[PDB]
Structures are given as structure tokens and as C-alpha cells.
Amino acid sequence: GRIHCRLVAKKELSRDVRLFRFSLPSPDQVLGLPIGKHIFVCATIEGKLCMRAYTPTSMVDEIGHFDLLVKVYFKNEHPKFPNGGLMTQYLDSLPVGSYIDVKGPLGHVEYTGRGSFVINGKQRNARRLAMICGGSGITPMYQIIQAVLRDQPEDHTEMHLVYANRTEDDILLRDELDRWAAEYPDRLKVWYVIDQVKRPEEGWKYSVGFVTEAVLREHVPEGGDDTLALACGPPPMIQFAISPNLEKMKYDMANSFVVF
Numbered sequence: 332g333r334i335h336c337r338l339v340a341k342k343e344l345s346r347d348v349r350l351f352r353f354s355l356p357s358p359d360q361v362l363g364l365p366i367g368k369h370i371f372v373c374a375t376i377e378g379k380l381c382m383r384a385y386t387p388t389s390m391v392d393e394i395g396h397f398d399l400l401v402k403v404y405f406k407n408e409h410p411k412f413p414n415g416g417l418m419t420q421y422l423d424s425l426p427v428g429s430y431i432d433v434k435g436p437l438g439h440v441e442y443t444g445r446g447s448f449v450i451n452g453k454q455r456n457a458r459r460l461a462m463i464c465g466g467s468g469i470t471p472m473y474q475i476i477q478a479v480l481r482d483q484p485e486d487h488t489e490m491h492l493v494y495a496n497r498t499e500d501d502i503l504l505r506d507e508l509d510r511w512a513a514e515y516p517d518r519l520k521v522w523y524v525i526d527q528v529k530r531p532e533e534g535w536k537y538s539v540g541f542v543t544e545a546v547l548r549e550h551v552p553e554g555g556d557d558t559l560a561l562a563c564g565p566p567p568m569i570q571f572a573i574s575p576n577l578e579k580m581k582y583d584m585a586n587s588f589v590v591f
């Protein structure tokens with residue numbers, strides 16, 4: 332089922348990331364999206380109506396609006412993908428006032444409370460949570476990462492994050508993560524891995540490069556019992572950069588591996 336939203340405001344955080352501020356058909360409500368799930372921002376472009384999943388980054392109780400952190404895929408920017416992304420340039424193309432119409436809640440992972448998951452049906456639980464995402468696949472994580480902190484401190488779920496990118500200025504939710512990182516070290520381990528390093532004149536200490544066994548070993552809870560791994564990054568990243576290694580750390584690669 333649909334809901335009629337309206338881009339009430341928008342912000343250009345940088346040369347290609349925008350913070351879109353939508354408003355709900357009714358001021359007295361919240362998006363009410365269940366932690367672990369997502370919403371589809373529908374639109375008909377060219378002739379085809381195309382669904383795209385997006386996980387808002389607003390505090391689950393914001394009344395009257397929801398924010399979307401979007402990284403715009405421009406055409407004339409990449410050799411392999413010369414024509415940009417389909418739903419992003421259309422969104423960067425909407426003037427504040429336009430209506431959009433979402434439809435949730437989709438997905439299959441839901442953080443039902445404390446360690447207690449339910450994947451593809453099965454209720455579950457875990458204390459050590461392994462998180463791995465790159466670029467935009469962090470929002471699916473952030474919602475969770477934000478939910479445990481808001482359950483402080485009876486939610487003892489230990490979360491271990493590895494957040495991949497291409498450059499330092501491309502680390503998305505960073506101030507927020509480096510803020511929490513300090514507040515709740517007893518439960519959130521943050522580690523940045525980056526492809527390049529714009530200016531080391533400054534001094535980048537985190538890893539440089541791709542995500543790999545060493546990185547995983549020295550950063551992600553030993554694949555044991557009551558230890559679940561969640562991941563959200565480009566297909567390749569998962570395929571051969573995250574999938575095999577988590578086996579190499581003895582995780583039950585069959586029921587402990589969920590992917591948004």
C-alpha cells in the first residue's frame with residue numbers, strides 16, 4: 332500500500348550527497364518503519380515505474396517527516412556506468428514541493444527487541460553482531476546501530492562494524508558514528524576501510540584498501556554460536572569479499588549469514 336509524501340525540503344551536504352526531507356500525509360504520525368525493514372520509493376520514469384529500497388535515517392519517533400540520505404549517481408561520471416543511476420538523478424531533479432509516494436514495510440530482518448532476530452521467518456538471538464557494508468549499505472545498519480543505543484543500557488548486543496568506502500570524504504554517516512563510538516564503546520566497534528586517501532598530510536590510521544580476511548580477523552567476532560553476521564554492500568563485495576571469509580572464521584554460513 333502507498334502513502335503520499337511531499338519533498339518539503341532538501342540539502343546538499345556535498346558535491347553528490349543530499350539529505351531529502353519528506354513530510355507524511357499526516358502531521359500526527361511517524362513513518363513507523365519496523366527496525367530491520369525498509370520502504371520502497373516508487374516513481375514512474377520514462378515509462379517504467381521502478382521500485383528502489385531506501386532505509387530512512389530519522390529517529391524512529393520523528394513526528395511529521397522522514398529523512399532520506401541519498402548518494403546521487405550522476406551520468407558522465409563513471410566509465411562502466413556512463414548514464415548514472417535511474418532513481419537518483421530523478422530525485423536530485425525534484426524541486427522542493429513535489430510529491431513522492433512510498434510503500435513499506437518490506438524486507439525480512441527485524442530487530443524484535445534484544446538480540447532477538449527473525450530471518451526469513453525464524454525467531455533468533457545473538458550477542459555478538461558482525462556488520463559489514465560499503466557506501467550506502469550503511470543505512471540498513473545505522474537504523475540498528477541507532478536502536479541498540481536507544482535501548483541503553485539493557486540491550487547488551489555487541490556490534491562490530493567494518494565500513495568500506497572509496498575515499499575519506501565518502502564516509503557517509505561519520506560524525507554520528509564517531510559520536511556514538513565514544514559514547515558506547517562497550518558495545519560498538521567502528522573501523523573504516525578506504526580505497527584511497529585524499530590527504531594523508533592529515534594522518535589516516537584506519538585501514539586502506541579492500542575488505543579482506545586480515546581485516547575481518549582483526550575486526551569481526553569469531554564466527555561462533557550466538558554470533559550473527561549481517562552485511563549490505565555491492566554484490567561483488569558480498570560475493571567474494573565477504574562471503575568466503577566469514578566461512579574462514581567458522582560462522583554457520585547457512586543460518587548466521589543474513590543480507591539486506
Ligand SMILES: Cc1cc2nc3c(=O)[nH]c(=O)nc-3n(C[C@H](O)[C@H](O)[C@H](O)COP(=O)(O)OP(=O)(O)OC[C@H]3O[C@@H](n4cnc5c(N)ncnc54)[C@H](O)[C@@H]3O)c2cc1C
Nearest residue numbers: 384385386400401402404409412415416417418419467470
Ligand atoms: C536495504 C537497502 C537500503 C538502501 N538504502 C539506501 C540509502 O539510504 N541511500 C542510498 O543512497 N541508497 C540506498 N540503497 C540503495 C538502492 O536500492 C539503489 O539501487 C540506489 O539508491 C540507486 O540506484 P539507482 O536507483 O539510482 O539506479 P541504478 O543505476 O539501477 O543503480 C545501480 C547500478 O548502476 C551502478 N551505477 C550507476 N551509475 C553509477 C555511478 N555513476 N557510480 C557508481 N555506480 C553507478 C550501480 O553502482 C549499480 O551497478 C539501499 C538499498 C537497500 C537494499
Ligand SMILES: Nc1ncnc2c1ncn2[C@@H]1O[C@H](COP(=O)(O)OP(=O)(O)O)[C@@H](O)[C@H]1O
Nearest residue numbers: 465466467495496497541542564565567568572
Ligand atoms: N570486488 C569488490 N571486492 C570487495 N569489495 C568491493 C568490491 N567491489 C566494491 N566493493 C566495495 O564496496 C564499495 C562500493 O560501494 P557502492 O554502493 O558501489 O558505491 P561506490 O562505488 O560509489 O562506493 C567500494 O568502496 C568497495 O570498497
